[PDB]
């Protein structure tokens, strides 16, 4: 969450595959009155205020990007998610279908909206995970283990704000991310669990096994043999929504000399990956906020993928060119230099 910007994904709509994927997501989420394309097109800034639209559109854009990547043949070797994003990770790994993933995202948003819980702010602080948790005032818990250097804390609005101000008095890094006014992964989210569990059981019918490629971030490492971590059921989603995100813990498992692609409508976690991932790895955004035309940025990402040794054919993205080729096409033999 947190990487939703006005007009996200409009440039990619021109590509046939991405537009078809967005239409499929819309048809998936038709009964609830949400039209993904309509949400993307709306110009008013209010569209992203309601968390339902934000979550649904974010998941849809990630699914569309994964469809684009899979079109060229790129098969991921690993997968790491962050808060909501396991659903996108679920689809990328293959444990979930597009309809099921979009339904899960929308019902997460719906359940969270129904909560009507007291406002609780979640902000990031520059202190360390171990040190901060002791320093956390009662009722406030670290939000996400982004990295050793930077960690975010989520909790009740008043305690979070007071602690952030005191830390600023301490000079440490202070920032409250736009979280729709609701704290996340705290005991506050525990209220929404039952209805979410029942609705997701109604949504997901036949859970399927997880893969070794996927590295769950809602379950500590030692527990990867548990029943919840085995398959992506309602328990997996609830755990990913309740417990804090162990984003950094999964980065220690990234082998040296690896290509890391940020599947998101904004490479927010680029700094976290750069600092907490081994220097040998390369980071590629695949999309940026308020860029003039995101198709160029996606093509630049694919080009950097080409430069890094990973084969990817950009022909699949665009419509096929009919052969035989037109008479008079420039010769290719003279260009090959040895």
UniProtKB/Swiss-Prot annotation:
Phosphoserine, modified sites: 227
Tissue specificity annotation: Ubiquitous. Prominent expression in brain, lung, liver and mammary gland.
Modified sites of kind N6-acetyllysine: 30, 175
Residues bound to an acyl-CoA: 149-150, 173, 275
Domain of life: Eukaryota
Active site: 83
Post-translational modifications: In adipocytes, S-nitrosylation of Fatty acid synthase occurs under physiological conditions and gradually increases during adipogenesis.
Renumbered residue ranges of the record's region Acyl and malonyl transferases: 1-319
Compartment list: Cytoplasm; Melanosome
Assembly notes: Homodimer which is arranged in a head to tail fashion. Interacts with CEACAM1; this interaction is insulin and phosphorylation-dependent; reduces fatty-acid synthase activity.
Remarks, miscellaneous: The relatively low beta-ketoacyl synthase activity may be attributable to the low 4'-phosphopantetheine content of the protein.
Task performed by this protein: Fatty acid synthetase is a multifunctional enzyme that catalyzes the de novo biosynthesis of long-chain saturated fatty acids starting from acetyl-CoA and malonyl-CoA in the presence of NADPH. This multifunctional protein contains 7 catalytic activities and a site for the binding of the prosthetic group 4'-phosphopantetheine of the acyl carrier protein ([ACP]) domain. (Microbial infection) Fatty acid synthetase activity is required for SARS coronavirus-2/SARS-CoV-2 replication.
Protein name according to UniProt: Fatty acid synthase
Annotated organism of origin: Homo sapiens
Gene name of this polypeptide: FASN
């Amino acid at each position: 969450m947190g990487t939703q910007w006005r007009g996200m994904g409009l440039s990619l709509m021109r590509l046939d595959r991405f537009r078809d994927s967005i239409l499929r997501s819309d048809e998936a989420v038709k009964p609830f009155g949400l039209k993904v394309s309509q949400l993307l097109l709306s110009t008013d800034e209010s569209t992203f205020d309601d968390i339902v639209h934000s979550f649904v559109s974010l998941t849809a854009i990630q699914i569309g990007l994964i469809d684009l990547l899979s079109c060229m043949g790129l098969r991921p070797d690993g997968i790491v998610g962050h808060s909501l994003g396991e659903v996108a990770c679920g689809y990328a790994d293959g444990c979930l279908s597009q309809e099921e993933a979009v339904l899960a995202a929308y019902w997460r948003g719906q359940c969270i909206k129904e909560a009507h819980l007291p406002p609780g702010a979640m902000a990031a602080v520059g202190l360390s995970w171990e040190e901060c948790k002791q320093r956390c005032p009662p009722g406030v818990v670290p939000a996400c283990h982004n990295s050793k250097d930077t960690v975010t804390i989520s909790g009740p609005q008043a305690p979070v704000f007071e602690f952030v101000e005191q830390l600023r008095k301490e000079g440490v890094f202070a920032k409250e991310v736009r979280t729709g006014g609701m704290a996340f992964h705290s005991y506050f989210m525990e209220a929404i669990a039952p209805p979410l569990l029942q609705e997701l059981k109604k949504v997901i019918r036949e859970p399927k096994p997880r893969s070794a490629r996927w590295l769950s971030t809602s379950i500590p490492e030692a527990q990867w043999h548990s029943s919840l971590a085995r398959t992506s059921s309602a328990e997996y989603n609830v755990n990913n929504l309740v417990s804090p995100v162990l984003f950094q813990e999964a980065l220690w498992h990234v082998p040296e000399h690896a290509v890391v692609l940020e599947i998101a409508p904004h490479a927010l976690l680029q700094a976290v990956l750069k600092r907490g991932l081994k220097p040998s790895c390369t980071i590629i955004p695949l999309m940026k906020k308020d860029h003039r035309d995101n198709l160029e940025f996606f093509l630049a990402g694919i080009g950097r993928l080409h430069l890094s040794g990973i084969d990817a054919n950009p022909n699949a993205l665009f419509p096929p060119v009919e052969f035989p080729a037109p008479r008079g096409t420039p010769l290719i033999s003279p260009l090959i230099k040895w």
